[PDB]
Amino acid sequence: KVSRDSKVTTVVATPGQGPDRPQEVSYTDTKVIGNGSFGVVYQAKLCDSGELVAIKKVLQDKRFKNRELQIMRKLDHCNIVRLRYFFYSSGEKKDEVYLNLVLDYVPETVYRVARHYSRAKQTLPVIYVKLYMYQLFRSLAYIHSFGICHRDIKPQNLLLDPDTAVLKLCDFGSAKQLVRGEPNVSYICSRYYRAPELIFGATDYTSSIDVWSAGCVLAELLLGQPIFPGDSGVDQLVEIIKVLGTPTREQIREMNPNYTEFKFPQIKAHPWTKVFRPRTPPEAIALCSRLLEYTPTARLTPLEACAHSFFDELRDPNVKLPNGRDTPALFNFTTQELSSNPPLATILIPPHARH
């Protein structure tokens, strides 16, 4: 139903949390902030609160398993974009059913912020690298604790509020509850951010592919451009081997056993300190090497990454943002997201953070 007031669109929408209790929701000021083959993305102003929201409109009846709505309904984390409501409506294609996802609106992304510093020929300050990378690992720790794998980690999917420096993970249209012993699609990530096991056509991967994508993001922030570009899987794999060196037979078996018997030329590894600029912090290089690992089980867990010394500055009691505001919430860990390694709370929660 559409009625005048600006144009006010009124729908009966289901709240993200709790049992299904649909309620009327009114919004106005509709404008397109995105568009793609998935559907349409809109901005809106909620009539009641006045808060800005984003409405992702998709056709959730297709061949692909559409887990996006069910995964998001289970998520409640400060570094994951919240799903306020969802509803159904008619789309551009007549007689079709389109799902509408009402999420908190976030103005920026890590990619957009990073691209500015690339254009300006500056380098993103390490404090923002620590802040953005730390919050992404918290979100990954939270989703992984439920067994959910994002499968599309990349800078365009990391929303930013530059005022508060709060990062929100989004774009759960590729996420899946990975089941140990159930095969999965091997074409699930995006260019420049697919883990080597995915590039080798592995169908038995795990949530550690998200950790590889985080390492690609981390290197990209430190570098000013993607570290493993390339149109094809061979192209990207050549970039990886040119940095990491030729994977060993055991490392290949950890990714996909079908390739263990091929004679790949032995290419020497390029030292990490030479990959990045000379001004790069040593602990950032140390964290990067523990993320971009051939063997998936060797990569750090998201919870382990947050405890890395590279994020020690964020745990400083007197740490402040460049604009003067205090840092966002960083040590409000729940037992759910601390499940994988509860003893890490000794390092994760600094002594001042406990009241």
């Binding site: 692909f64 699609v185 074409y187």
Partner: peptide, 5 residues
């Protein structure tokens, strides 16, 4: 591109 049905 989620898992095919």
């Amino acid at each position: 591109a989620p898992d095919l049905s």
